[PDB]
Design a binder for this molecule. Sequence first.
Ligand SMILES: CSCCC(=O)SCCNC(=O)CCNC(=O)[C@H](O)C(C)(C)COP(=O)(O)OP(=O)(O)OC[C@H]1O[C@@H](n2cnc3c(N)ncnc32)[C@H](O)[C@@H]1OP(=O)(O)O
Ligand SMILES: CSCCC(=O)SCCNC(=O)CCNC(=O)[C@H](O)C(C)(C)COP(=O)(O)OP(=O)(O)OC[C@H]1O[C@@H](n2cnc3c(N)ncnc32)[C@H](O)[C@@H]1OP(=O)(O)O
Ligand SMILES: CSCCC(=O)SCCNC(=O)CCNC(=O)[C@H](O)C(C)(C)COP(=O)(O)OP(=O)(O)OC[C@H]1O[C@@H](n2cnc3c(N)ncnc32)[C@H](O)[C@@H]1OP(=O)(O)O
Lengths: 253, 253, 253, 259, 259, 259
Amino acid sequence: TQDVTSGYSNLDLDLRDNGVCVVTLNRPDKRNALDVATIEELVTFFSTAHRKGVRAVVLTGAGDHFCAGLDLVEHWKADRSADDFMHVCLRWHEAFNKMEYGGVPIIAALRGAVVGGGLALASAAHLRVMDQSTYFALPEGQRGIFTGGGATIRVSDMIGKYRMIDMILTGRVYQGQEAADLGLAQYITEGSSFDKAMELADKIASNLPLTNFAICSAISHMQNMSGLDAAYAEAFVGGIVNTQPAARERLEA
Amino acid sequence: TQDVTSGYSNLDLDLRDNGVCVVTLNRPDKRNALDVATIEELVTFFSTAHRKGVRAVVLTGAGDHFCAGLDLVEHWKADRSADDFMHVCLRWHEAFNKMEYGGVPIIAALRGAVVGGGLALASAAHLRVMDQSTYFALPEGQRGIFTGGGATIRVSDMIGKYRMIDMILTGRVYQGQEAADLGLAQYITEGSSFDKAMELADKIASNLPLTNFAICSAISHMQNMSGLDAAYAEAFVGGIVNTQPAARERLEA
Amino acid sequence: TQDVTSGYSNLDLDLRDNGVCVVTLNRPDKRNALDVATIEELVTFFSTAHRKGVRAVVLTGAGDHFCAGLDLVEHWKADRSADDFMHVCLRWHEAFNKMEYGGVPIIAALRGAVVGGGLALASAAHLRVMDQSTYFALPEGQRGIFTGGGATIRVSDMIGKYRMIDMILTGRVYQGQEAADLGLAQYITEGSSFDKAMELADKIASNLPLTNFAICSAISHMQNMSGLDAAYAEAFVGGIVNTQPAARERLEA
Amino acid sequence: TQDVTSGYSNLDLDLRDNGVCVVTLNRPDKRNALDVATIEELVTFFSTAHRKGVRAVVLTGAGDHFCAGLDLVEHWKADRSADDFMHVCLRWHEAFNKMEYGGVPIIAALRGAVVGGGLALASAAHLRVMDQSTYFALPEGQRGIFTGGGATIRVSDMIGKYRMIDMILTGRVYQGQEAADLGLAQYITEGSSFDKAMELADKIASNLPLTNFAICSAISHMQNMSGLDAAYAEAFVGGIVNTQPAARERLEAFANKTA
Amino acid sequence: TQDVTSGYSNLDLDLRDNGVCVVTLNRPDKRNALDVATIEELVTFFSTAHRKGVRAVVLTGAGDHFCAGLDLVEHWKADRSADDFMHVCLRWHEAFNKMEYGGVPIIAALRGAVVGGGLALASAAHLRVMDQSTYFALPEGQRGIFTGGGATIRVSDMIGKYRMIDMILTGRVYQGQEAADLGLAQYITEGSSFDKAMELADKIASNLPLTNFAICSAISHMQNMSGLDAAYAEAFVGGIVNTQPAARERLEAFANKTA
Amino acid sequence: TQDVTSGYSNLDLDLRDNGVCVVTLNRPDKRNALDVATIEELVTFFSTAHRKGVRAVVLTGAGDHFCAGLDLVEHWKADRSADDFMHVCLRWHEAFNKMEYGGVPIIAALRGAVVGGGLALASAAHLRVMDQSTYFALPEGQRGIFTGGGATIRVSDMIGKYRMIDMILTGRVYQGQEAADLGLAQYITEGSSFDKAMELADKIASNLPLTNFAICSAISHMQNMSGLDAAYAEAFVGGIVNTQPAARERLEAFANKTA
Ligand SMILES: CSCCC(=O)SCCNC(=O)CCNC(=O)[C@H](O)C(C)(C)COP(=O)(O)OP(=O)(O)OC[C@H]1O[C@@H](n2cnc3c(N)ncnc32)[C@H](O)[C@@H]1OP(=O)(O)O
Ligand SMILES: CSCCC(=O)SCCNC(=O)CCNC(=O)[C@H](O)C(C)(C)COP(=O)(O)OP(=O)(O)OC[C@H]1O[C@@H](n2cnc3c(N)ncnc32)[C@H](O)[C@@H]1OP(=O)(O)O
Ligand SMILES: CSCCC(=O)SCCNC(=O)CCNC(=O)[C@H](O)C(C)(C)COP(=O)(O)OP(=O)(O)OC[C@H]1O[C@@H](n2cnc3c(N)ncnc32)[C@H](O)[C@@H]1OP(=O)(O)O
């Protein structure tokens, strides 16, 4: 429906009949580099997806490469001051925080380069599916750049603080089974990562809206707390989710 | 001694001469599903084990399956309100928090199904030993249920926040070497997981009570703090543990 | 230069022309066991390395073994009170916290035994390179000792809280590819770990001082915060690092 | 300007030439109770105020009472499920978190009742100015319910965890100088709270945008961290704010004696 | 009832018909010093009070002094090792954490000395009522020792980290209105603190059990989190408490004008 | 002694026979503005004071004003890059964190201006004694800049997050009894703040070294944790401090009646 798919210049959207929305980064000529305009579009989409009824998102990059990172051309031309760039980083965080804590399951279908800000974007999804062409790296460090978008936060949760520091400090590249085993992606396929992502998304979309909402917002929040306080919060999350009428019906079913 | 082993209807206890207590979930006809009464028995046992002198616990399920999770039959019949269930979840947390932070080493000897609330229980032990029949999953999500018992907290520490979200979101199953390598169990055996657990427990029971106490309570607490404040707490833990007379004797020995 | 290399009795220093400083634990006759005097030397070196211009550190042990841990001979002879030892532990933390958050990249070239306090020291480096002779363990637990130096904090980040508890509780030893895959070291070599560490250090030293500084201090700090507050801090770190003139020059370059 | 004050209904907006925007809850016949429509307007306004160039906000309620809290009528009628209401609460948090961490100085000009969700709203502003008619309460318990809008977090920061528990647990009312001294408001006036709020806002709007942004976002974030980690973050905030070109003229003013 | 008040020795218990239970430390000849036996009784009582249906607790000390703290005699005599005493402290925490996070409203009716561990005990209650004879101190330093029972945590929440450090570092004594204003007690009376505590408790007991449970457990937990994460948890607490069937009658009372 | 008071320039040090060391900022003609050289001396002194045996510190400023904050002249002239200044701020934190968590009791004897970084410095001490000439402010905004030295952390702990935001956001000045009551200083005197500080310090120095160390380091660390985790840490702190041999004589003093 146009109410979900229109309004974006750098994203191509395709809403399926079961509520799965394919969100395709659409600047293939620039390897889907993320400029401020695209980030704002991500903020808008992920701020409203839940309320608009989107049941799950399959996030992919148009072309052979998922995302080449922050748009360094725009950055270089903009000749940003430290405060201008700090502000740009907060917009990246607003988009990625809405993805991580927004409650709509996001499954990234990766191909080719998932680098720098592109790895930050991939990390903001709940699930990642990589194929035989996919590789991960934070190569900007070699050119004096500190990766943003919360990669230092999310990639540390994915592969461990020390492997994350190794990646940004050395520009080390991971791919194939090695990358999956490291924790960069939960799924690796010999075929189409898009098709595998759709299979996962369709199954997820068939689950209860509230249950998926809790799974895709409460767990990240609880990981930010002491486990002794998270326990208490979890009891309230379980109280609401597990006593919903639709849930009771499924148990009976 | 009856002072340690009597008083439980759903648990079968066997106290060995070296202080190792075998705690066996004993509802094999229901695949050791955890109902409120069993949870209360776990709260009682783990609230008092340290003060009663138990040196280590080998936790296992009677039968071919460790634990089938929360008792969904009791749940369905009870037709719980959100607040009734929130309260039931707090009891699960009281039992599992007493296990994790209580200071008595717990070694789970797993077999067959370790699912849903059963994985939450297994996660509350310090060590897990799995065998060739053991498998892990959080299958309730497919039926609209959010897993409780702190699995979102402990399993995230075990396998990573994103693999934990993947498990609850998709119902994904892990077993064999793959599960051990993922972080679901530190030990995998080709033989008896109970026998391997006993070997581990006997060695642990031969160590100093206070040292084991600190290992099995302080580390979980320190992980809940900033590493800069945990450092300070660790200095005091080390100060008390490492200057005990029994410790000095062992160095000399 | 003497301004960087002189002043240490238990450490041997070698400053290379590109700012890489080799810091060699130098008590090979005692397997580089760490006594209070050596710890104080580590506090001094790592408190001043950044301001003295050191660009990266290659940390190694003289001889066939990296570090045998806390000096148990000094400990036993000192017959320390709980408060005396608590104070000794705070000095270990001061040294290791200066290593972890000080902003100077530290690459440990490991060989042989990396045990007890020696594993705590290795863990305080950002990167670890192990060879075919390297092994890791926390064997003091068997003799009633709780490992200090923040190993419970850092090793948990490296291999997971539960694998860390397993190591201290059982004295379990890891080595070879198994240890690297577990997360004990990011690099494993069939040749010289010192040579591989130097290769890494030389590449790191060729990067921008400020970028390396942020990578080697900000990430550890952000991991101590809720991801929602770390996001904000990261924006300011990115703002300062990514708008430095030297960075702009490298983009143009 | 039309791009800042247009499109709203429950809120009345007035952008002054110096960048101060007066945001008035405009449902006086309902004592400005916050229903879902009004919360969504607050989410919209505070999500974009900074980027739209608003320099400061004076938040007030039309009529004799600032805000009576959650619209209990809409709530009772909707007969909400626990998940329906949890979702409503998250919208409140989206609005109030944007107010607290958004970087735009907000000064609440209070009058009369500042109760329940109304106190949650007042607490989400950086500064509060109360007058002699202002009174504070968390009467939720009386209705048999729990507060929301982050009142348990913000009011505890304002008056202390134990005084916040006392307020919701007993329904205790605070007003006058006692309320100001307790920490419910930094300013209390014998006259118009609105005029005092405008005075504060005009002075704030005359300061540097970046500096106000940091003050109105960084401090709340640093309070959520261990002080040892917050110190490191503070250094980066100061590094960016304290070396901005716009501050050098003022630093020079001190160098001599013009300042 | 016998299933609530039986089996104790160091504590005297009186369960009133409205569910208010009066818990009295009963060792007046020792100024109610807390020895290990008394702490275990507090652990037992507060671990089960909620499930036993206690609606509110009025905690008080027999005699002229609320509680003189750790039983120094038992302590000195036991000549405890550092690990022995660390274990004793953990039992204190088990009792006091159950009081703070247990969900049962606790109102302390203070008189005379509320010192050392005695202040730790008073701090573990949600509300404190002091009279004109009440005084507060953390004289541990004088004995050459550190406080316990979570006083460094709770008293800092009550009066501020720096005032808490001042108290233990100098042995400074607070009393009267000054103590109340400092944050040591929310209520101060010219008469009987016990009667004022009972008034508070009876009103609290007339509110909804679930609502009081949330107020007396959720707020302390949310203070331990970043405010951004606490907000999410608050939404779930409100979702459950605010949609409970028992609250609808009261919401209706407001819908009209009976309320 | 020469091994404690030698080698400094910007600081004047006087070690008294009872172990109390008077640390005086000695740049009165500059109102004791903290430049990089002075911060490095504070880092050096507080990094070693505990191991050197200093029992307590009385921190004061030469002249009529405690400390005017960051040396704005050096700052303006250096025309620092954001990273240069971030690094300067980290040095400030190294000094102030060593003061707060170092374990050596610090008592600030204030006079006149305690502003900007000067308040950050005063806030890093455990106790503050103000006189009738003392006034507090965070006038950074006026200079178009942000505070530093952890003022956003420590002052928020002292007077409340919202009063701290008010101070930097409006430049509001506090003084007299009002400042003391707000939480800016635990002690206010009609006479000499220095003499009152010395009285406090001498009494503190007469207590046990280990006990003071814990009080002056453990409490700040425990405030950075969830209260449930802090309780466990407190038990270990108490285990070590409360069983120290040196405290038994004092415990015995109570056993009888000599105490
Ligand atoms: C995210 S969790 C949040 C938890 C909470 O905040 S619960 C609410 C707490 N907050 C409270 O419990 C505050 C409840 N309200 C009051 O105590 C009083 O209304 C006031 C003290 C605020 C003002 O008194 P007054 O001047 O006498 O006005 P009133 O009581 O006669 O009410 C006038 C109208 O305002 C209406 N009104 C008034 N308050 C609301 C409302 N709150 N929702 C809906 N309609 C309302 C009232 O119904 C009337 O509507 P009408 O009959 O159509 O003319
Ligand atoms: C988890 S860490 C906790 C750290 C702390 O709390 S340390 C203790 C702090 N707390 C303190 O340091 C408080 C110390 N006590 C006092 O200052 C006073 O006793 C009071 C101000 C509380 C009351 O004064 P008063 O009415 O004159 O009573 P008293 O001082 O004559 O004492 C009467 C009896 O109570 C006894 N008594 C009194 N206090 C204790 C006790 N505290 N342990 C044991 N027996 C005690 C006292 O010994 C006497 O016993 P008796 O000789 O057999 O008749
Ligand atoms: C880590 S981020 C920290 C952020 C901040 O702290 S920013 C600063 C906040 N802090 C402030 O904004 C405080 C600014 N200072 C004042 O408001 C006043 O100087 C006082 C109220 C503190 C004292 O007033 P007064 O007795 O009239 O002294 P004065 O204003 O005549 O100044 C006398 C000398 O002290 C010098 N002086 C005075 N303050 C400084 C300084 N602050 N840096 C350098 N030189 C200074 C002043 O320049 C003069 O130098 P001179 O012309 O060579 O004789």
